[PDB]
Enzyme design. Sequence first.
Site, short mmCIF file in Angstrom:
data_model
loop_
_atom_site.label_atom_id
_atom_site.label_comp_id
_atom_site.label_asym_id
_atom_site.label_seq_id
_atom_site.Cartn_x
_atom_site.Cartn_y
_atom_site.Cartn_z
N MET A 45 0.53 -1.33 -0.02
CA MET A 45 0.22 -0.03 0.25
C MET A 45 1.22 1.46 -0.01
O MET A 45 1.58 0.86 1.04
CB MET A 45 -0.99 -0.20 1.04
CG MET A 45 -0.06 -0.58 2.57
SD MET A 45 -1.32 0.58 4.34
CE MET A 45 -2.44 -1.18 3.21
N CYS A 46 0.03 2.10 -1.16
CA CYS A 46 0.69 3.13 -1.05
C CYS A 46 0.81 4.78 -0.23
O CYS A 46 -0.72 4.10 0.63
CB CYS A 46 0.08 3.76 -2.04
SG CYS A 46 1.83 5.69 -3.01
#
Lengths: 113, 113, 320, 320
Positions: free
Chosen positions: D213-214
């Site tokens: 995830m960013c």
Amino acid sequence: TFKSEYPFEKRKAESERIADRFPNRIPVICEKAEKSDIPEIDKRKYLVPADLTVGQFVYVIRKRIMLPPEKAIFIFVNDTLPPTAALMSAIYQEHKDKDGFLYVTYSGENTFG
Amino acid sequence: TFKSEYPFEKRKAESERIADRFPNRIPVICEKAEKSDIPEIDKRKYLVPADLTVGQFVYVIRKRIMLPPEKAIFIFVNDTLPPTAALMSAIYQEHKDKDGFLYVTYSGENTFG
Amino acid sequence: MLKIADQSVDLNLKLMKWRILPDLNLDIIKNTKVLLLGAGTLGCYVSRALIAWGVRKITFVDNGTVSYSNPVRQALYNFEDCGKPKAELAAASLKRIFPLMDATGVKLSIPMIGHKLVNEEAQHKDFDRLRALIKEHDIIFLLVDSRESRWLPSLLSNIENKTVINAALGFDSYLVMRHGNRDEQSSKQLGCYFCHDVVAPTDSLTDRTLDQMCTVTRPGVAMMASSLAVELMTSLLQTKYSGSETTVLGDIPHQIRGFLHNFSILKLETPAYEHCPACSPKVIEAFTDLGWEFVKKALEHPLYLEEISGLSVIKQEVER
Amino acid sequence: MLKIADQSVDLNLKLMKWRILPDLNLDIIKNTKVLLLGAGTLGCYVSRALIAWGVRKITFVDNGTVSYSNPVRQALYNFEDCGKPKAELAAASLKRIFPLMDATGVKLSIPMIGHKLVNEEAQHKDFDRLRALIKEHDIIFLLVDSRESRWLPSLLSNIENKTVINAALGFDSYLVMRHGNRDEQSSKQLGCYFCHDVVAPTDSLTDRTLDQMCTVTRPGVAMMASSLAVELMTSLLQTKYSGSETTVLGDIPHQIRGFLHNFSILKLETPAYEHCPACSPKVIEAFTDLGWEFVKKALEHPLYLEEISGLSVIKQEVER
Ligand SMILES: [Zn+2]
Ligand SMILES: [Zn+2]
């Protein structure tokens, strides 16, 4: 509030008694928003003519309520801002309460930055 | 979406065909929130047992969907977060759609600051 | 260190496109020239949300000075700033945050309708000054603090065909809306801030007393109105989807009104009202024909504006 | 000039009580000692909303340093601040805004569950340090950036019977909620951040990659979550009305979740879940009996926490 002091039966009655009598008027209940900071008067019941526009109806409100022209307001009809150029009849057909009355709320317009 | 590919009649049918057959299961349609950033699988239809709790149902979702234990999720049922200790039966009685199915949505929990 | 700083900020932005929304257009946002009319509580929070979005050109327009109570509520000023001109101080503060910012401050006074003109030529220069600033920018944020102050900017922006995002605060509520712009090909124009009532803006300050109204607000309304105003702008700058009023960033509501007492937000829409003292075609025609000669008359005589827009015609109608 | 500045700010606050809401209690708000766990985007905006509300004592807890991409998103830092410790810089920045602020910064590391303990004694000192800070303050704002980081603070706050306001951000959404506190006289406790899933928080950072995830978010979520978190606090600090869940400032929602794509805000409520890895009575009892000896085991062995809370009992149940 109007509803807070009258049951559906008594309210659904005067509505019909108003339609049968004045099929040209519109049973409108106009009162100030709860947390709004502007004037108000005991007159909450109004029987405006169907051909009268929202704008025209707004004039009455601010006049009758004695609101100065320097301050603006906006009206809510079922959490919606009705077109100013709309006929009260058209508005009544789309937002009338099952009790026969068109409930309207008004409040001071926001101006700070 | 499930509804986006099946009309009320066809959906209201399988619901009854599911109740008449398994009066112990609960027709649940579970799919990921629209703008959520987490895994999902073609299996949207689930027939969970009424005595199973929301939490237990959540385990299935993340397991079946292959979601890692380091990331959490939360589920929506009619724009509401159901109690984790609630029975799926109890939830089905309060939020079932008129089509017979209990629509559930899941999304990744917020963690940034 | 400026270079590495620039890259680090740019990468943060690039990642939302590359890994979250590939259809996101960051460039259009970056190159948008923004004009902020008002460097008060809204102006400060809006500018902060804008730089975080990658916007590089922001111009503040305010003629005031930092007051003693300002810092705690206006996020670009400090105690030591008290007494200094806001507009320039605001631009300087943005550069302290991100040095590559093309931030400018213009100490300009916006002629207010309903107020007596004190210096014809001086205020004629203000008018042309304002119109020029509006013309050179792409998005105009109307963040002033009076009903009157929103009139001239609204008209000029419509005239110069610029997108306007109007934000206004109440004690417990707020309004965020994008004014409609006139289009020849479409007979559907969105309303503006003045389309909702039937009175011409006029002097609401000179006669004001604490009895009329207090100006204090719950701190939260400014932050909310500001963030929503900017998010509305970034979405509106995106190409909308074929059969809907949505973009890669979501909806593009015409109007948004929020309330703190019940933590709610309403999305609303209204059409342009033909008798609007601001966007009525008659008012636009008057400006197109007489320019400043017409404006000067509306500024000193709000009731004249009502005669031109047609608000008198509908009131006189009900008057009978 | 400090005096006149103090009076001007105080008057702004007094006016909302005197002319808008006479029942408003400003004093309780002013004297509230606030502990902000996290001096990142949320910590900076929350602190700004708090000072505007008159809060005088704010303590930042963060062990990081100002990064190059931070300034444009974290409203208390400037480009020149890069590389310096955040907590102390944040406290110093608040004083630059309003010099009478009792702002302090503590560069403390919050032991994270699921991460290997590297220095027993050193992290035992961190634990006691954290508990002490929590104990001395009145309202704890949980503004950290991981699921794990919210565990220890949640437990300690519950143990020390302090009100906790938890805010968390997603790319396009946010969550703002007040954790429930245990009451002997009432058998109704509100849920906490951990009552909504059935897995014990654990390491979500060490193994993390861009693929997982960013961390980037739309700028607007931070400003909104922050303003709502503070408005929730000020309302919650007011005496509620006899027969309702409302105060002079409005509602006091348990949980609030907002979304930018459709500009919506939902008010929700959830009860405390008996098998919660954070607020389950079994977990509270474990802490009350073994204190740190129990915590150290949960920190290195999240699966143990599940055995204690009972999450294993319900999973094993379905396992059969
Ligand atoms: Zn208009
Ligand atoms: Zn819990």
